[PDB]
Amino acid sequence: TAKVREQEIIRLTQKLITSITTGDYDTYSKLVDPHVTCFEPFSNGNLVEGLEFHKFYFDNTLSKRSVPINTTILSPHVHVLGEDAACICYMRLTQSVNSSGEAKTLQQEETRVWQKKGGNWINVHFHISG
Amino acid sequence: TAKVREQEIIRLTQKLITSITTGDYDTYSKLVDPHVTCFEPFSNGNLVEGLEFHKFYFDNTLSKRSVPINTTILSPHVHVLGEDAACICYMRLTQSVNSSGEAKTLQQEETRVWQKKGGNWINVHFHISG
Amino acid sequence: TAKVREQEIIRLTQKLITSITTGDYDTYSKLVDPHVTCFEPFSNGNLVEGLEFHKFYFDNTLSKVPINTTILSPHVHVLGEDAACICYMRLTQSVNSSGEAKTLQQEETRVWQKKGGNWINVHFHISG
Amino acid sequence: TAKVREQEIIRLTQKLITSITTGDYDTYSKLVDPHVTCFEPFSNGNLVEGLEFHKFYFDNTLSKVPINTTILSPHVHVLGEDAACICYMRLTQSVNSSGEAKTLQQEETRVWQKKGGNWINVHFHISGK
Amino acid sequence: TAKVREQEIIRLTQKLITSITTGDYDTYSKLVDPHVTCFEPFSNGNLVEGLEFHKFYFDNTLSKRSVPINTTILSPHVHVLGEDAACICYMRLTQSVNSSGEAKTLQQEETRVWQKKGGNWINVHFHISGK
Amino acid sequence: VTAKVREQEIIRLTQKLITSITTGDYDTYSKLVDPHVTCFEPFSNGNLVEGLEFHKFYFDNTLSKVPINTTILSPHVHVLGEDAACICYMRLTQSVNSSGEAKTLQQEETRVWQKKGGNWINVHFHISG
Amino acid sequence: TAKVREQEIIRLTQKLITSITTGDYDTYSKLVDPHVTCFEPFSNGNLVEGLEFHKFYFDNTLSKRSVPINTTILSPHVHVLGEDAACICYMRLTQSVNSSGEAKTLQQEETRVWQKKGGNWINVHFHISG
Amino acid sequence: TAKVREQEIIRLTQKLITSITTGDYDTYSKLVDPHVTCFEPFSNGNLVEGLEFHKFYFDNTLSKRSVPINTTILSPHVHVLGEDAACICYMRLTQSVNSSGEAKTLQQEETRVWQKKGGNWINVHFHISG
Amino acid sequence: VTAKVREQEIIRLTQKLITSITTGDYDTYSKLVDPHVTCFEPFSNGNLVEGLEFHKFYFDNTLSKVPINTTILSPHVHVLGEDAACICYMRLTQSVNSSGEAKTLQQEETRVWQKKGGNWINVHFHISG
Amino acid sequence: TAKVREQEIIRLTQKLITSITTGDYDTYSKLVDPHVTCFEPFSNGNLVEGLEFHKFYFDNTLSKRSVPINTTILSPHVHVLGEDAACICYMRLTQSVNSSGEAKTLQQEETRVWQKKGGNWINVHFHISGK
Amino acid sequence: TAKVREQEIIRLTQKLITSITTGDYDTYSKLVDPHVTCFEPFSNGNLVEGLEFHKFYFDNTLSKRSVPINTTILSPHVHVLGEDAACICYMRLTQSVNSSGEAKTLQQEETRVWQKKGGNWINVHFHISG
Amino acid sequence: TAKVREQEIIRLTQKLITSITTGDYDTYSKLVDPHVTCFEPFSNGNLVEGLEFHKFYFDNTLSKRSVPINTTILSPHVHVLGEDAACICYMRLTQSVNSSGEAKTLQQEETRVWQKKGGNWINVHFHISG
Amino acid sequence: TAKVREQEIIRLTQKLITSITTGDYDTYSKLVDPHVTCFEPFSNGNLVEGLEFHKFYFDNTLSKVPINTTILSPHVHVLGEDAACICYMRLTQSVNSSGEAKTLQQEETRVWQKKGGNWINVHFHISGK
Amino acid sequence: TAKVREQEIIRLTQKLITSITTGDYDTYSKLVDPHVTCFEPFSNGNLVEGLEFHKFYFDNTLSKVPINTTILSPHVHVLGEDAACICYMRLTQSVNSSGEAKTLQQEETRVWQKKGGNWINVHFHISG
């Protein structure tokens, strides 16, 4: 059944997004490939490879956010590409409130490619824009 | 072997990008799934599905010229996911010249997911950011 | 039957939006109530009533450029036998006669009511 | 009577707005469906679903300045026994620490459905000019 | 019988608004008092008196308009002050299109005081804001 | 010319009314302004609002809480009948901030008065500026 | 009587403003003292003396008028100073329409001092601003 | 004689300007008519009547003066209108220094109409601008 | 008070000099202004320039090539001696562009006159504005 | 003997400029006529008369300055008009530093008319521009 | 002798710069390696490989410049790296004049790496900034 | 073989970049020629020679911290010119976080020419652009 | 005589400036060294050498508006028999098609060397404030 | 001897520039003429004469931040036995006490004259 496999990718992507917002680099480093490639706003239009580029935010910005946030995932589409591969597409809304009573919402679009290596799904590439 | 698979994906992508810049929707529609999903600047942050969104450009803008353009593909990385699936990521430079001989270069980052369906490689999803 | 009703409202809505982009006021005036209420950017923050406010655009704008519309994440609330709500985002691709493309996005709520066995749009809310 | 039901929906909407402006989430969460859908400025052009998106503001800003709300030009569409839609403009008067007055205007559409004998708000659309 | 009087004030105002949009000064000058007082955006914050201030627009602006427009009257409230006096207030939406073809909507808020002088309803004072 | 006294009564009530506004005296204001008054004013954001609640909000949060001086210019009074009158005038408000810098604000005001039960009540007004 | 003299000063002023708008320098030069002083925006904060400074606009602007206008005199206040002197204070609204068809309104504040010299009323000083 | 009256109007004006700068409202209220009219920048293009509008600045600004100033009266011109009336026109330079120590100069143009009422000279109208 | 006539002569020459400037009459100007005149003026960019060449350039390229009116205000004349005088005044120049829009420009001028050979010559001047 | 008279006017002007920069009003008031006419940037385009206009700066600005400054006189030209009259013109550079420590240079152009009244040279008129 | 080799690199760089300013792609294509790498302002911060990226300007902008120009080469430093390799560094000033009488100067800094392949010096990499 | 030579250059460059970010001038001065030439943003478009220009940063800015930074090297291409010379070209991404937890990414493009002098590889020239 | 040589250099500089402003390259190229060095705004902060950089302007803009040049505060440093340096400010008056006047100021240093008995300008530095 | 003279002027010039960056007015006042003329940005387009104009900066600025100077493309015109001109660009690296570096560039001409057997700077021109 494929609908079961769509649910696992969604489950894993939720798990991955939770690890980013809570600064839990240990879960992140187990779900994302050590040779992950990516495009994202901080990569300044370059394809960057490796976890260290992202570990830098877990060390300095994600683990040190005092602000409360709420994340919403919109329109999750999962392409089951085979028995060992999948692609998930979704928009991500982050609500936040700063030192004042001033709230803001930010939107990102994300593509994440999951691959089954060993018997484990690992995110081998992602593209983020917003 | 792996290298040949990477070359096949790079060829398909080269031919896919060729059809776009040429305005050759006949080749585009054979390479891109009819239920393709995608993120691109013109989707305004939304995941749009289907070919009609892109066909709009083949019939009204990609048909148009005579501006000369040269396209350069940079740093293409191909993930071979399985026998039936692959992902390619690359940057795209477009050189152009407007009226009065002023040259500009534009850069796009692209993720294309490829899937073998019926023995044929089809682009089931892509993600573009400026 | 829950999904049948959803598809029926999505059909009517597609039909309505086509009538807007075509400039086909005959179809629009048959699907939209003569006493429709609405919020839209041109109403300038006011609730306006009646088709005339909208007929103005069919007569002086919409009947005059290629475009393509996309309806995103349509959700239909089935409200009973004779009522439904549909809400969606709408992307309008267009060109400026100079060869440049633009995409505009609007958010739409439309309330459908079955009056005399016919589905009519009695209220809609459009924002950007 | 149509007059009677129109008034019921207006009173449900006043009760709901009061719960929003006072930070009373228990009342809000009983009037708004757990799977509510909505468009509002903070949804950034998206259709968002569920209470959590709104509960975020009850927990982090709403339970905090004097204000007065006015409901302008309310129109209630009665849609059968168990459904109604109401649309109106909402004027919010407020004063900052500086004692400076300020009026904000929003336009709202709220779809109400009677579920389990209770009137629940299943979708709302909020915008500003 | 007050709802009778209200529908008459509304009809007169509609007739008045129509004479403005169409540039029919003959109908305007029969409905508006020759010594009408008014506040409006073109009066620059001043209470102006007399028709001559307004006739200036019928003879220059309100005539030369060939642009299509549609007028909507919103939230009309009529205060029936007595047998010989009434007051009406409303918002007025004006849609229009460019020669380029782009549309815009303008909003004004209008108060109009009507007095029965002789046997006719005359607009003796009006107030307009919003630009 | 028996009506010249009738225009002095309106002027006196209007001055009494504006006095109530600038001193924060809601009790006098509520006696002079109809409970179902309609109005346009800059703080209504272009909308016709009804009732005293909209205006009581300023008496409770801004007007009772800096030195000011108010001038009424070119007051014209229209006598419409035995039970109805209309007055229109411009209002200059001078003020000074904390820093000691002077400021003058101008508003145009139309006020409609109606005799109800032998008492002149302000049933509609329109303010711009 | 007091009100007749007010009416006279107002009449002279209306006559003077009419001469200004229609470019009629013959009437202006009979009503305005040859050694008139004045403050006006074109005097750049200076008190200017003589008719020549004003004749300049009659010969180059006021008579080259190619635009329709209407003038309104607001809240005229006359100070009857003596037998042979008066002062009038008023605001002047000028409505006009540009070449395209767009209307505008300008406001000026004016003080005019009138003196009866040789049995004839002459404007000996005026002060204009916006 | 003509020059003695000019000297008198100038003297009254200097006396009046001194009362303005030192916040001396007792002298101001004896020299300025209780029904004085005026145009000045704080009247927002309106002709305002009465002393109360001006008393406001004596009680809240002119008497709260905490800055040194010097006033110069430039090119005073007196029109002797009759026995009981005069008009004076002049420019007023006000030098001052801010809290830090930076000097500035402001210019105003003033017309003042004086009337002899009950044998005493009273300023019945004035027009100020910049 | 024999010197009051001496100040009228300076005034007459100055008016004659400014007349020569506005009419483009270099011949009169060159007779009234010293051949080794020194000056500050806005077109000298803050520098002291010497000689007539700098100013002849305007007579040849701008002043002889639009209607204008010139007003001289508050002319003060200083009589320094039998052979020397100084005059200072403000100058208002009104003009109108092609479009018909009016314009007024202000300049402050000091002019130093010296009797050389029984003839008053302008040996230094200073213009600002 | 004219070059003699020029060096004296230059010395007087240097004495005058020094009394300005140092805020010594006693020396200023002995060199500047009590009815001195002047044009300067603080006069806002007007010819002002009398010392009182300038004494205002000696008593507020030209005193309270503790900033270091250096003054340079450039291109001084002296017109010797006669025995009792002379004119001098020059550019004046003023350097100065902030409390922050940043330097700036300002330039003014100055004309000064000197008259021998009695047996003393008095500055009867001056013109300053450039700001 | 090395000073002779410095002169050949300078001679070749002059020859190369002449071919760019005159639009002579044929000389350019013989002096620059078909697998040349480069950084330059139009590469938008990317390393681009190949001649086609540059051929695009010869076809569209360099061969179609009507404007006259003068080139000046400042501070040419030549590093002789070996018998088959050299590096030359210099600043390049381009004077030009547009349709009007308006002249302008632009400055670029250039590094060019020359390699001896066969018996011919070819430019195998260049970096341009400005 | 070729690959080892490319690895040696990439190692030297890695060690060179390490010394810069660390502030370790002792290692920098051993890798960079004493007569090194260079173009960089801080040279304001000029070719500067010698180490003292760069030593200024080791003693006054690279010594400073405690801002965390991560550096990423992208697309390194190494030209092996001969036995005694090589050229490496790459892009450099620097992630950083200022006070208040705001992250920024900066990109630089770099050309470094390497020469074997006395059996030791020395960076004789480099070219940096932002 | 020092006065005599100072005058020679000033006249060489007037001749050179005249050749620049009239477009007379034959005269310029005989007064300016073929290996001249220079700083000027168009050199963009660089020391440029040779005539070609300047000949570019003779061929493409200079041979084209009335102008008057003034040399201000010339100072000549006599540096032995065969060398001198002169520094001065140059004011250029000009008029555009619109008949609008305009003054530009440059500061210049020119080093003159007697080579082959002829005075040649071997280096110049030009700036503007 | 042509190059010896060039190196002598480059030595003196380096020595002069060090005296500026050090705030060492004693050395500066020995290498620069008491009647030096100059153009520099602070002279505001004027030719100024004398050391006092420059002493102002030694007393209120230069004697108060780390910096490094670089002299670029120095060219010396040997003008005779007793005169030379040197022109060069000058880069001044500095920090703002907040940790940020800046580079400023100036273009300098300096005229050296041998008076009494000693080289003195009689004129200099500085622009940016």
Residue numbers in the entry:
A (entry chain G), B (entry chain D), G (entry chain B), H (entry chain B), K (entry chain G), L (entry chain D): 342 to 471
C (entry chain C), N (entry chain C): 342 to 405, 408 to 471
D (entry chain A), M (entry chain A): 342 to 405, 408 to 472
E (entry chain E), J (entry chain E): 342 to 472
F (entry chain F), I (entry chain F): 341 to 405, 408 to 471
From the paper:
CaMKII has a unique architecture, in which the catalytic domains are linked flexibly to a hub domain, also called the association domain, which forms a dodecameric or tetradecameric assembly. We reported recently that the activation of CaMKII-α by ATP and Ca2+/CaM triggers the exchange of activated subunits between different holoenzyme assemblies.
N. vectensis, a member of the phylum Cnidaria, is an early branching metazoan. The sequence identity between the hub domains in the two N. vectensis CaMKII isoforms is 62%, and these are 55% and 53% identical to the hub domain of human CaMKII-α respectively. The hub domain of CaMKII-A crystallized at pH 7, while that of CaMKII-B crystallized at pH 4.2. To illustrate this distortion from planarity, we aligned the pH 4.2 N. vectensis CaMKII-B hub structure onto the pH 7.0 CaMKII-A hub structure by superimposing the four subunits that are furthest from the break (E, F, G, and H).
